[PDB]
């Protein structure tokens, strides 16, 4: 075995991240062990501000190009089964999943 696993869920789509995030809670609590539920980091807003205009002219209008990236993370304690079950299931959309070994 039982080691200090962190699962770091980073994705853009809040809804398609929190269907996965819920399935790891409900996937672990099925075969119960521990957790400390989903952590909510500040959402990072990737904000670009370019001119609307190609070339010069016209009254100066710009767009406000944004991309969000919310990070959840979920602590757990398990063997090399429950990790390799819970991570490989509940994948699919534009969702990145990290797996820390223990502590550091």
């Amino acid at each position: 075995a039982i080691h200090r696993i962190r699962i770091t869920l980073t994705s853009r789509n809040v809804k398609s991240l929190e269907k996965v995030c819920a399935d790891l809670i409900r996937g672990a609590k099925e075969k119960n062990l521990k957790v400390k539920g989903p952590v909510r980091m500040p959402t990072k807003t990737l904000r670009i501000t370019t001119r609307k205009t190609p070339c010069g002219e016209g009254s100066k209008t710009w767009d406000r190009f944004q991309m969000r990236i919310p990070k959840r993370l979920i602590d757990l304690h398990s063997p090399s089964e429950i990790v390799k079950q819970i991570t490989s299931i509940s994948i699919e959309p534009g969702v990145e999943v990290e797996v820390t070994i223990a502590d550091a």
Binding site: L46, T50, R64, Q66
Partner: protein, 52 residues
């Protein structure tokens, strides 16, 4: 094969648009290196969506 030599290492000599090799108004930030127009083309596809 010799001579074609300077700092092509900093200065806009070096950096250019990844889409079209034009060398102004360049979105350096955030490891894009698109020209500012080549944003609005390759923008939705990237992920920057206009919200407010």
């Amino acid at each position: 094969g010799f001579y074609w030599s300077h700092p092509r290492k900093f200065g806009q000599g070096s950096r250019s648009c990844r889409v079209c090799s034009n060398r102004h108004g360049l979105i350096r930030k955030y490891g894009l290196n698109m020209c500012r127009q080549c944003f609005r083309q390759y923008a939705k596809d990237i992920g920057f969506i206009k919200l407010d």
